[PDB]
Amino acid sequence: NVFQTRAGCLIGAEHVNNSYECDIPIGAGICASYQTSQSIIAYTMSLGAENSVAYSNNSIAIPTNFTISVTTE
């Protein structure tokens, strides 16, 4: 199986119309990953989940609860 990208061309991996997070970077927005079938797929990476706040000129959102988190650096 032969696939052509902007950073050369990839053989041995199949194209997918979906989009997921980047697992193994390749270049020009193309990331490859190991599906599950048990094959290797080359897709276009997705930046993140779509979201749209319900903005309005007289609407607010005030939290009613909290959570304490510990982060290691």
């Binding site: 005030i62 982060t71 290691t72």
Partner: protein
């Protein structure tokens, strides 16, 4: 208090388990060691190279060739090894500069996040910063940032101000919210409704200039007391 204590204990247990299970979290500290080991190994392995001479060992050359060209071979080896050492030293200098650049940031973080509380956004961990605890590590330091994150949201209907007697009342510290029928004033980071009164609001002129003002009664804590 009890809920926060339990959450902190659970977070500490969770990070301990995460460190105990996954071993790929210390890549930053391992990269320096691997790079230095590779540099030293390459520098050592560079010895066994002819560099254009007959042999890679000068003792063999001296024990087989007479001085007039043995010295030429030795000079070739000298040039090669000297330039290789030059390259290694330059690489070490650059890497040491990078490490010092990182150590300065580590010192700044230790001075600010640990010894005090930082208002710099996204400097001592995601969310609002509370405190930090330092932990040592081989050729490095590890911080445990403690942060505060709001959890469960709601929906309300705000208002920039409120008219009571033609005047305009603004919140001293907080916002005006409505649960559908009544109006309250609450702090901006935790839902805690309170009755609107002359202790949470300050007057500022008439109320035909503000855009979006909605009028409702404002309680006075003195009239009922004066009634008796």
């Amino acid at each position: 208090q009890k809920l926060i204590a339990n959450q902190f204990n659970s977070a500490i247990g969770k990070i301990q388990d995460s460190l105990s299970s996954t071993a790929s979290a210390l890549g930053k500290l391992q990269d320096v060691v691997n790079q230095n080991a590779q540099a030293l190994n390459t520098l050592v392995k560079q010895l066994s190279s002819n560099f254009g001479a007959i042999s890679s060992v000068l003792n063999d050359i001296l024990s087989r060739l007479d001085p007039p060209e043995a010295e030429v071979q030795i000079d070739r080896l000298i040039t090669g090894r000297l330039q290789s050492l030059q390259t290694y030293v330059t690489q070490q200098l650059i890497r040491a500069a990078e490490i010092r650049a990182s150590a300065n940031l580590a010192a700044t973080k230790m001075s600010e996040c640990v010894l005090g509380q930082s208002k710099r956004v996204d400097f001592c961990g995601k969310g609002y910063h509370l405190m930090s605890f330092p932990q040592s590590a081989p050729h490095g330091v590890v911080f445990l940032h403690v942060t505060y994150v709001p959890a469960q949201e709601k929906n309300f209907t705000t208002a920039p101000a409120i008219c009571h007697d033609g005047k305009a009342h603004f919140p001293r510290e907080g916002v005006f919210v409505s649960n559908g029928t009544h109006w309250f004033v609450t702090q901006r980071n935790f839902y805690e409704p309170q009755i609107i009164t002359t202790d949470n609001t300050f007057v500022s002129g008439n109320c035909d200039v503000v855009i979006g003002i909605v009028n409702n009664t404002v309680y006075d804590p003195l009239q009922p007391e004066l009634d008796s």
